[PDB]
Ligand binder design. Structure first.
Ligand SMILES: CC(C)(C)OC(=O)N[C@H](C(=O)NO)c1ccc(Br)cc1
Ligand SMILES: [Mg+2]
Ligand SMILES: [Zn+2]
Length: 889
């Protein structure tokens, strides 16, 4: 098992200047002919010429139009083609090959593969070597000339990168298209698509150069009516890059293509972006609300790659966060501007502090720029993406918008058309930092630790107020726990966006302020502070850290009601909940451990419940925000604060707290559920696919959240509401009616009803599957078996498999059944999936990531299943590496 090390980066001894491909698609095989115009680089030391080539069937290979002979002049082991240096020319030469590959049986969905009736490629990160021989690394830049041929009836639409320069007929009912793409690119950005595709199109005119850009969005004919929102999102993305960053699209055409079988959300192939259908296609009748923000994000994300990834490239894969963290950051800016809802930022923070914090305290913890890898596929992680994006966002927080845009433009102008590393970006930001501080002595050298240091910092506070001096002090401390990557953690550059709230009137006491914490600890003093303030800390969540605010619940309630910053209000609510959860958890734990016949529980703070009611009843308050405050923190957020967590005790704890709040607020909940109906379910624009109202979707989120609370509580006659809800035109509503009906005898009636509504749309059926999987049912294991036998069956579609199993794994009480039956079940699914798609098998391992955080019995159960998976003779490299790292073996 070869380990690649970041420090070992060396430029290739070879150069590939030109790629000329002929891809001939036939019924039972695809023939790929390739000519590489190559050269010897200055780093060459007379070494063997080694190409990557995985699973290729060689018909012939040649150097300068002369056939090479196997064994004497080359070896091929199904992974590397080695041409011995004595047969390698010392000047410019041509390498050619013809190989056979088989897209029809390629269920790994990497390289060239068949998705339903569409032939499509996926080359990032190491997929191009599954199509033809190459030096398959991102610093090998080349020109591409690509011809594709196929049966015309089956594959009338042929696409690849660049300009289509020829179309032609071929004997036997075939046709071909030639695409020339003169600008240099890395091979992971190559793509080809063949199929009976239908489209929507539009023309965009750029802001400054006034260039006409043709926009095309493609799907299978069945779902062509689901393309409109994607096209609108693309237009929005282009406008935003123009308006915020001053960046225009440089090509004459951009294609987006939806396919049904895809490992991730989408892929930024140059001029030919390819998408999971669930992240491109939607309609009001056949999609839940979540799809609209999902398509906006993923379309935006792939578009913003055109600069941050495609025009400025990576030197090597260790720089992945330079294009991914930065593009996620660009997409976050875009989405926040488009939605104009505070929940957009809150949703990203909620995901970071649950999923990414879990990863960062797990054995899988890595910095956003890792030091080594075995399988590059395994490092497309929430750390690299989402913590990466927070690190990219902190530059904006530190610099402010004007100097951030200046630094960003320095980065683009200096590295456009070239490869780059994380240091290059830091360098450009540093130049802006100098301009901002107005001295060329300032530097961001410490900031680089954000790229190299793993783990989540903990930031804690103490306060002092001198009423006679009008002087306020914030004492701040930072600490990162040692782990396997660094024995000694160094202090980070942590920007702390802060406000000071006057507790008497809720007003701001100081102007916008960002504390720059660069040491292990510091004291920040403020003068002319007229009264003791309540501090509003890490506004906007200004650094990816554990925040310990040391505030009382009284102070937190005041922030929750009156602070100006959405995140601090949300965090103060979160903190109140966490204090309560930890206290009740330990009370339940003690009673269990000591086998108590009776015991006391600490009730929920009454003033907190009053504050929730106050906010819910405020008609000028935000519906999206409201849905967060009535929800306890995510289980994966909570687990970061409990050792040896007994999941049963946590389920009991949540139950208690929800029942406490519901006993006081259910009538308020019900009243609001009813009053919100008119605006939430307004049908005025139901048949206008370009009209998307994120505030209205948030009102539906709130209604569906309240309905779940009222259903669990068995609120009098709520089943009537549930039944009426199932008749709503909006899938978010009628799918909610299924999951909340879990607590009633009508569940399987709604099961059947909603299935009938979902079964004839591929993507809608997958949302139905998720709804069933996530249903709070005592008989959920029997239900899963039913899904397997009646709907899922032997599908190899990752959307199907993920929909059936992943939501169930979040069932705290049932997935973590003490028998270990849930662990057993998902381990069986992982092993089964790993036979044909190792990437998705690794995705299905997600519930195991917290294994060493659970109680000793569940730890043992999980570890047993992982060791069982590890001992499977046919385990993939990707899955083996992942489980080896996760189990510290
Ligand atoms: C937009 C989000 C953030 C959801 O990400 C993706 O949908 N896909 C990844 C991507 O960055 N696309 O640009 C991706 C591409 C290739 C590989 Br290998 C892994 C992951
Ligand atoms: Mg299918
Ligand atoms: Zn990306």
């Amino acid at each position: 098992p070869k380990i690649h090390y970041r420090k070992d980066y060396k430029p290739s001894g070879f150069i590939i200047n030109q790629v000329t491909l002929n891809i001939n698609i036939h019924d039972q095989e695809t023939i790929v002919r390739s000519v590489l115009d190559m050269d010897i680089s200055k780093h060459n030391v007379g070494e063997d010429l080694v190409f990557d080539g995985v699973g290729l069937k060689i018909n012939e290979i040649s150097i300068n139009n002369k056939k090479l002979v196997e064994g004497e002049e080359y070896t091929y082991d199904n992974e590397f083609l080695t041409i011995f240096s004595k047969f390698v020319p010392k000047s410019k030469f041509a390498f050619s090959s013809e190989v056979i590959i088989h897209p029809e049986t390629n269920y790994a969905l990497t390289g060239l593969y068949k998705s339903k009736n569409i032939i499509v490629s996926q080359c990032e990160a190491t997929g191009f070597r599954r199509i033809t021989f190459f030096i398959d690394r991102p610093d090998m830049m080349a020109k591409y000339d690509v011809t594709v041929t196929a049966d015309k009836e089956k594959y009338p639409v042929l696409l690849s990168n660049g300009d289509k320069v020829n179309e032609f007929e071929i004997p036997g009912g075939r046709h071909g298209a030639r695409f020339n793409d003169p600008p240099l690119k890395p091979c992971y950005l190559f793509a080809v698509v063949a199929g009976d595709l239908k489209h929507l199109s539009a023309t965009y005119i750029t802001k400054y150069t006034k260039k006409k850009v043709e926009l095309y969005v493609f799907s299978e004919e069945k779902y062509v009516s689901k393309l409109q929102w994607a096209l609108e999102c693309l237009k929005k993305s282009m406008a935003f890059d123009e308006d915020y960053f001053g960046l225009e699209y440089d090509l004459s055409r951009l294609n987006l293509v939806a396919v049904s079988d895809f490992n991730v959300g989408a892929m930024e192939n140059k001029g030919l972006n390819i998408f999971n259908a669930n992240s491109l296609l939607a309609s009001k009748k056949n999609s839940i609300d979540f799809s609209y923000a999902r398509i906006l994000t993923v379309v935006g994300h792939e578009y913003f790659h055109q600069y941050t990834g495609n025009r400025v490239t990576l030197r090597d894969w260790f720089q992945l966060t330079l294009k991914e963290g930065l593009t996620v950051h660009r997409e976050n800016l875009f989405s926040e501007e488009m939605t104009k809802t505070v929940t957009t930022r809150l949703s990203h923070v909620d995901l970071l502090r649950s999923v990414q914090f879990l990863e960062d305290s797990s054995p899988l913890s890595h910095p956003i720029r890792p030091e080594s890898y075995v399988s590059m596929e395994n490092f497309y992680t929430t750390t690299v993406y989402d913590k990466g994006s927070e690190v990219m966002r902190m530059y904006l927080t530190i610099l402010g918008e004007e100097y951030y845009k200046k630094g960003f433009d320095i980065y683009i102008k200096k590295n456009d058309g070239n490869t780059a590393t994380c240091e290059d970006f830091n360098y450009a930001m540093e130049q802006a930092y100098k301009m901002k501080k107005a001295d060329n002595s300032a530097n961001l050298n410490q900031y680089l630790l954000w790229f190299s240091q793993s783990g989540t910092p903990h930031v804690s506070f103490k306060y002092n107020y001198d009423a006679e001096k009008k002087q306020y002090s914030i004492h701040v401390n930072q600490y990162t726990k040692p782990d396997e990557n660094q024995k000694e953690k160094k202090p980070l550059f942590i920007p702390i966006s802060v406000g000071l709230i006057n507790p008497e009137n809720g007003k701001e006491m100081i102007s916008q302020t960002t504390l720059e914490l660069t040491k292990e600890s510091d004291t920040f003093v403020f003068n002319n502070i007229a009264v003791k303030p309540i501090p509003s800390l890490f506004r906007g969540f200004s650094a990816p850290v554990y925040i310990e605010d040391q505030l009382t619940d009284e102070e937190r309630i005041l922030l929750l009601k009156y602070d100006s910053d959405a995140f601090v209000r949300y965090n103060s609510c979160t903190n109140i909940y966490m204090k309560q959860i930890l206290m009740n958890y330990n009370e339940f734990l003690k009673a269990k451990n000591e086998k108590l016949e009776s015991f006391q529980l600490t009730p929920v703070n009454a003033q907190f419940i009053d504050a929730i009611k106050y906010l819910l009843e405020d008609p000028h308050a935000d519906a999206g925000f409201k849905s967060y405050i009535v929800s306890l923190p995510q289980d994966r957020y909570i687990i970061n604060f409990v050792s040896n967590l007994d999941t049963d005790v946590l389920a009991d704890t949540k139950e208690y707290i929800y029942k406490q709040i519901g006993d006081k607020l259910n009538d308020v909940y019900y009243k609001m559920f009813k009053s919100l109906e008119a605006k939430a379910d307004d049908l005025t624009y139901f048949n206008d696919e370009s009209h998307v109202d994120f505030d209205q979707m948030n009102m539906r989120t709130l209604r569906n959240t309240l309905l779940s609370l009222l259903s669990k509580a068995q609120y009098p006659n709520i089943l009537n509401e549930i039944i009426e809800h199932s008749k709503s035109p909006y899938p978010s509503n009628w799918l909610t009616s299924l999951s909340v009906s879990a607590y009633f005898d009508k569940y399987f009636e709604l099961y059947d009803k909603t299935y009938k509504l979902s079964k004839d749309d591929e993507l809608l059926l997958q949302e139905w599957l998720k709804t069933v999987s996530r249903s709070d049912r005592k008989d959920i294991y029997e239900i899963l078996k039913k899904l397997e036998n009646e709907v899922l069956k032997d599908s190899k579609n990752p959307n199907d498999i993920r929909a059936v199993y992943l939501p169930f794994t979040n069932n705290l009480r049932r997935f973590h059944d003490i028998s270990g039956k849930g662990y057993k079940l998902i381990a069986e699914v992982i092993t089964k999936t790993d036979k044909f798609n190792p990437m998705v098998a690794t995705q299905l391992c997600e519930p195991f990531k917290l294994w060493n955080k659970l109680d000793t019995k569940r730890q043992e159960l999980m570890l047993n299943e992982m060791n069982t998976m590890l001992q499977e003779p046919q385990i993939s490299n990707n899955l083996k590496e992942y489980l080896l790292r996760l189990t510290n073996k």
